[PDB]
Ligand binder design. Structure first.
Ligand SMILES: [Mg+2]
Ligand SMILES: [Mg+2]
Lengths: 127, 139
């Protein structure tokens, strides 16, 4: 697959600037993008059945972080599978750039000169 | 070898990390001293010391790597104030633990992966400076 034409993608992030950046990146490849400012708003949009092909999930959000949002999505999918035999599995990718940048920023602020980086630390994972 | 003649302090509360870091550095010829905590590291870094660099775990109980680094820098700043001598220990964060833990919780919570290095739109970093008034301009 070269393009995201015909795909509809949910971007979940409490920071509107991140939502704009992520949306612009995905639309460049043809995606239709819907934004959600919280995990709560996202769970509402993902009530099964829904029309989303993938979701990018911020980690640090107040009230409900991205891990709790994801657990709730997987619980919904598990209930539907058990009640209907239909197996939904929304692709969910974390947006980890924020947490990594914040870690390096605190290293710098504390007075460190740099960091040791192992090959895995800055790679993306699409599993 | 690459680090022959260098002495390096490894600060990490996990013995396995200390083993791996010291083993790597010795492969390059370095002398390695390990410390299990910030408080131990600060005792070892009383000025003057003989260390050429320090690898600093960020997450440790009682004193984390940021606090330990701030106190090292305070030691160095006081030395400059009192003696005029310049001390600036290279300190590199060991971040693999915190980043591992984040990626692991992504997968444990049920995510299919993560994006730390995103695609960046052509226009993300581009912009034009514009002036309200006409203005000549040169290098
Ligand atoms: Mg956030
Ligand atoms: Mg630690």
């Amino acid at each position: 697959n070269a393009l995201l034409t015909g795909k509809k993608i949910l971007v979940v992030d409490d920071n509107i600037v991140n939502r704009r950046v992520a949306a612009g990146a995905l639309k460049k490849f043809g995606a239709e993008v819907v934004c959600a400012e919280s995990g709560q708003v996202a769970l509402g949009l993902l009530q099964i059945p829904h029309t989303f092909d993938a979701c990018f999930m911020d980690i640090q959000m107040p009230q409900m972080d991205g891990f709790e949002a994801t657990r709730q999505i997987r619980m919904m999918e598990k209930e539907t599978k058990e009640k209907t035999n239909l197996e939904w599995h929304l692709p969910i990718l974390a947006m980890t750039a924020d947490v990594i940048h914040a870690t390096y920023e605190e290293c710098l602020k504390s007075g460190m000169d740099g960091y040791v980086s192992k090959p895995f630390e800055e790679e993306n994972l699409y599993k």
